A paper describes a structure:
AGO proteins are composed of N-terminal (N), Linker-1 (L1), PAZ, Linker-2 (L2), MID and PIWI domains to form a bilobed structure with a cleft in the center to retain the sRNA. Arabidopsis thaliana expresses two AGO proteins, AtAGO7 and AtAGO10, that display remarkably exclusive sRNA loading preferences, with each largely dedicated to one or two specific sRNAs.
Replacing this loop with the equivalent loop from Homo sapiens AGO2 (HsAGO2) changes AtAGO10 miRNA loading behavior such that 3′ region mismatches are ignored and mismatches opposite the guide 5′ end instead drive loading, as in HsAGO2. Mismatches at positions 12 and 13 of the miR166 diplex are important for miR166 recognition by AtAGO10 in vivo. Aligning the primary sequences of HsAGO2 and AtAGO10 revealed that the second central loop is divergent, while the other four loops are highly conserved. Thus, we suspected that the second loop might be responsible for the difference in duplex selectivity between AtAGO10 and HsAGO2. We tested this hypothesis by replacing the second central loop in AtAGO10 (residues 714–720) with the sequence of the corresponding loop in HsAGO2, and expressing and purifying the resulting AtAGO10 mutant protein (AtAGO10-714-720-Hs). Thus, the second central loop plays an essential role in establishing the specialized duplex selectivity of AtAGO10, possibly through direct recognition of the mismatched 12–13 region of miR166/165 duplexes. We therefore reason that, in addition to opening the AtAGO10 central cleft to enable duplex loading, the chaperon system also positions the central loop for recognition of the miRNA duplex near the guide 3′ region.
Author numbering: 126 to 222, 234 to 242, 262 to 393, 425 to 946, 971 to 988
RNA sequence: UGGAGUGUGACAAUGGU
RNA sequence: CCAUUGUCACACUCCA
């Protein structure tokens, strides 16, 4: 039917003013009429068809139409200011640069602003040039060259969206690099970086220049007045040392001097960017959020939708100022640490912190391990020193480490990885009278080349041993931060936890810490390798302790090729021995939660990540039906209130600060503070969703996460969801900062990306039991 | 593959005509 | 055709 409505706006948190990029567009719903084309031929060239329509209209702008400027999308459709008096016009206006075109002519906001978007694209095409959807214009921000002849301006790309303030036009900034409009002499001088007038060019250099100039339009300069432009037919094999240029038809071999041509501002694309060019473009493409806001503001002031014949003939209005919206800043939560450490409560300042004089909540006390060395550079002494230093860092960071390994560090070679792992596991099994190995510190080389894949495939699919890898350069140059951040992984990998929310411990967080609640997750990772052969694999994670929700336990399965839905939540196959057996992922995760806590969950919160607005409804229907069926098949009369929350990240809605000279910014990359929520004036007006940016920026802008709360049953308040999501966004296991998208929907993608190595329709090999209950993937 | 983030390229899924 | 999103790869920056 319909999604879950909005139960209001929040009030808690501080106040601040954020200026997003959503220019409100006063829609002119006076009158708009569509039309069509009755053409006997067919032209597939968008630009050519557009020129045709323009010329044909000019041929009869005032003769028959009358004081009108009709539009044209690019298909069988024309949009005017109304219904024109004529009904049976006949025109066969040809184009000369050649077939007769015989013709016989015969809810309020959506259609009107679809016409608005059509005329927007028409204006952009008429003024600037088109390129992969995004229009780019030179005279925007003083374009400058970044390479030999490649110079990059600042383009843009609009998209109307039916937001809350009345539908609004959107704007973003995209950059492309095109060749400079300079004489060929200077172009060659900059390309080769050497003297060219007195120094003859080599054959390889000549071939490179010919390839670079292939397809480049050139205008003759030997004529003062007739500077006709021609396409480059080729370069002749034979300052007279400069080879002649072939233009025109291949049969009509015309030779011109290299100095008798010029660049005609190339249209589509230049030669593929190199390493030295991509770095400069990256240095220029993304700037501080202040500069991003300035360019977004400028690209509409320059484009000037206000003063335009189309705007005059329709009345459409777009304010040249970015939208100003109020957006509360949620407060950071309190974190409880083990009492043995100097500090027991640390609050995150700007969304990040470090464990100075702090100790993890639970130390799993690893006492058996081995270190396998997959390299020739690092040797026994260096590997033993690295292991000892990691042990000392782990002991000072919270859990006891056995100072000496079970077996001496078994050096090996990359090719015999299976033999090395088998020997190490079996030797250490033989010793200690058969006690399983807690962890193995692999040390794999810099450019492993599937060694990492083979290692993390064997150690989990076949052996059942929790592993941990470190590159060679880190071993050679160890740092306290690096050792601490690997110690966090080692601690969470053994079923322990290291950070816990103070609110959850006290059982005070709303609608979560009063009855058993499990916070799920989901994601997919398509193969992008061939077609119909490599299955796309799906992952699901779920919490496994109610008083504090920090421990997850994921499990993965393969599914059909490039299917976005999580194919198998609840699958039933006939089994004559047992009957109509059930299974999937939901049954297994609920069973694991029940075993690991004691009480069946009584409220499911689900964080399905990565779906499109086009298929929100279909994915909601299928996943929620699967959840209901799975839970109903676990115990009769067991229907927990589910709460879908779809997470999106790749969205083109930025967020800046009202004044960029104040304390309303982070330490660096002075965009918004970590924790802002913007659920007013930029969102789906009738569906409950809210932007959010829980992660401190580092450079460039900060792409806020766009949570889109789908079907909701247990009646969360909007402030309740915002607070719970921001708070949950802090308890990240493998890091000490604040994550962008919440860990329940982060671990899913992380485990799905992990599971791609397990394969080598066609389900993946199962994970061993003793590496499933713990966070193997993280 | 210590981790977090934001730029680009390539490829891909889905909604309306 | 017009979009909304996703995966992968590379580059850069930052952490005690
Ligand atoms: Mg993902």
């Amino acid at each position: 039917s319909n999604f879950a409505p909005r139960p209001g706006f929040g009030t808690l948190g501080t106040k601040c003013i954020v200026k997003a990029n959503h220019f409100l567009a006063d829609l002119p719903t006076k009158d708009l009429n569509q039309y069509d084309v009755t053409i006997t031929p067919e032209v597939s060239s968008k630009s050519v068809n557009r020129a045709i329509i323009a010329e044909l209209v000019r041929l009869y702008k005032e003769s028959d139409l009358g004081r009108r400027l009709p539009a044209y999308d690019g298909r069988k459709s024309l949009y005017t200011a109304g219904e024109l008096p004529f009904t049976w016009k006949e025109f066969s206006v040809k184009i000369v640069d050649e077939r007769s075109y015989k013709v016989a002519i015969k809810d309020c906001p959506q259609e009107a602003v679809q016409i608005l978007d059509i005329v927007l694209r028409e204006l952009s095409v008429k003024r600037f040039c088109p390129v992969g959807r995004s229009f780019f214009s030179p005279d925007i921000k003083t374009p400058q060259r970044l390479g030999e002849g490649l110079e990059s301006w600042c383009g843009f790309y609009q998209s109307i969206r039916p937001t809350q303030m009345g539908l609004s036009l959107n704007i973003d900034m995209a950059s492309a690099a095109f060749i400079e409009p300079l004489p060929v002499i200077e172009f060659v001088a900059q390309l080769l970086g050497k003297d060219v007038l007195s120094k003859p060019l080599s054959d390889s250099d000549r071939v490179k220049i010919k390839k670079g100039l292939r397809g480049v339009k050139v205008e003759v300069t030997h004529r003062a007045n007739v500077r006709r432009k021609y396409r480059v037919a080729g370069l002749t094999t034979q300052h007279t040392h400069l080879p002649c240029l072939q233009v025109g038809n291949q049969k009509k071999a015309s030779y011109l001097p290299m100095e008798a041509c010029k660049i005609v501002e190339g249209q589509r694309y230049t030669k593929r960017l190199n390493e030295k060019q991509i770095t400069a473009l990256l240095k220029v493409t993304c700037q501080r959020p202040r500069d991003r806001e300035n360019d977004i503001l400028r690209t509409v002031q320059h484009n000037a939708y206000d003063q335009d014949p189309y705007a005059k003939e329709f009345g459409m209005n777009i304010s040249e100022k970015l939208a100003s919206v109020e957006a509360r800043i949620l407060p950071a939560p309190w974190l409880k640490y083990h009492e043995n450490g100097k500090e027991k409560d640390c609050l995150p300042q700007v969304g990040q912190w470090n464990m100075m004089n702090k100790k993890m909540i639970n130390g799993m006390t690893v006492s058996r391990w081995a270190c396998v060395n997959f390299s020739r550079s690092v040797q026994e002494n260096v590997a033993r020193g690295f292991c000892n230093e990691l042990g000392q860092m782990c002991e000072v960071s919270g859990m006891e480490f056995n100072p000496e390994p079970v077996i001496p560090i078994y050096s090996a070679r990359p090719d015999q990885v299976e033999k090395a792992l088998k020997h190490v596991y079996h030797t250490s099994m033989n010793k200690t009278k058969g006690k399983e190995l807690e962890l193995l510190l692999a040390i794999l080389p810099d450019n492993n080349g599937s060694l990492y894949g083979d290692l993390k495939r064997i150690c989990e699919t076949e052996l059942g041993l929790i592993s941990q890898c470190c590159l060679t350069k880190h071993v050679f140059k160890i740092s306290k931060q690096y050792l601490a951040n690997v110690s966090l992984k080692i601690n969470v990998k053994m079923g322990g936890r290291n950070t816990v929310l103070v609110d959850a411990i006290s059982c005070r967080i709303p609608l979560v810490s009063d009855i058993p609640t499990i916070i799920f997750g989901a994601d997919v990772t398509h193969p992008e390798n061939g077609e119909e052969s490599s299955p796309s694999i799906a992952a699901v994670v779920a919490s496994q302790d109610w008083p504090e929700v920090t421990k997850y336990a994921g499990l993965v399965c393969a599914q059909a090729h490039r299917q976005e839905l999580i194919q198998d939540l609840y699958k039933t196959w006939q089994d004559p021995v047992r009957g109509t057996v059930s299974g999937g992922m939901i049954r297994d995760l609920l069973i694991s939660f029940r075993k690991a806590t004691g009480q069946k969950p009584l409220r499911i919160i689900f964080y399905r990540a990565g779906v499109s607005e086009g298929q929100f409804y279909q994915v909601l229907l299928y996943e929620l039906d699967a959840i209901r069926k799975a839970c109903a098949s676990l115990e009769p009369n067991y229907q927990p209130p589910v709460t879908f929350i779809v997470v999106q990240k790749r969205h083109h809605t930025r967020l800046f600060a009202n004044n960029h000279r104040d304390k309303n910014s982070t330490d660096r990359s002075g965009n918004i503070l970590p924790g802002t929520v913007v659920d007013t004036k930029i969102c789906h007006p009738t569906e409950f969703d809210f932007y959010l940016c829980s992660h401190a920026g580092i450079q460039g802008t900060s792409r806020p996460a766009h949570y889109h709360v789908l079907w909701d049953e247990n009646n969360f308040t909007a402030d309740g969801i915002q607070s719970l999501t921001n708070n949950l966004c802090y308890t990240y296991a493998r890091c000490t900062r604040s994550v962008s998208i919440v860990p329940p929907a982060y671990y899913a993608h992380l485990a799905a990306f992990r599971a791609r190595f397990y394969l080598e329709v066609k389900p993946l090999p199962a994970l061993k039991e003793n590496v499933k209950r713990v966070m193997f993937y993280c």
